[PDB]
């Protein structure tokens, strides 16, 4: 289930983090605007960029902790506030996070693994609720 998926992803996180985030940037090209340094590069070129690997993994490092700390796929208000108040998230809307979890759930459904895809969809919807409650537009 959801808690087991956190262990599955964590066991190969750098791989999952890159593949999921690449699926996100490819499904939603306009999101590369928030990552100007990724425009005009293929997946393999991004996977060889140091900042891409490190940052994408750090994103998923924290995302798994937010998911780990959640109760019934509802994240703690503190994690939501942390995400909203980060300097690097100033200028991001709920739609940004909304699209990341669309790509995440679609990636899980297409992986053919036993991910609890419905729980991650809920987790993303609830995280968006918490992000809006914490002050994100």
Author numbering: 1 to 137
Question: Mind quoting what the paper says about this structure?
Answer:
Our model protein for comparing methods of RT structure determination is the coelomic hemoglobin from the marine annelid Amphitrite ornata. In this study, structures of a multifunctional globin, dehaloperoxidase B (DHP-B), obtained using several methods of room-temperature crystallographic structure determination are described and compared.
In this structure, the heme iron is pentacoordinate in both protomers, with no evidence of a distal water or dioxygen ligand. There is no electron density to indicate a hemichrome species in protomer A in this case. A water molecule has been modelled in the distal pocket of protomer B. Due to its position, this density could also arise from the alternate swung-in conformer of His55, particularly since a water molecule at this position would not be stabilized by hydrogen bonding to any protein residue or heme propionate. In our SLX data, difference density indicates a weak area of positive electron density suggesting a dual conformation of His55 (data not shown). Modelling of a dual conformation for this residue did not prove stable in refinement and so only the primary conformation was included in the final model. The observation of conformational change of His55 in the ‘swung-out’ position, in contrast to its ‘swung-in’ conformation in the damage-free structures (SFX and NX), implies another site-specific radiation-damage effect. SLX is particularly valuable where limited numbers of microcrystals are available, requiring far fewer crystals than are needed for either SSX or SFX.
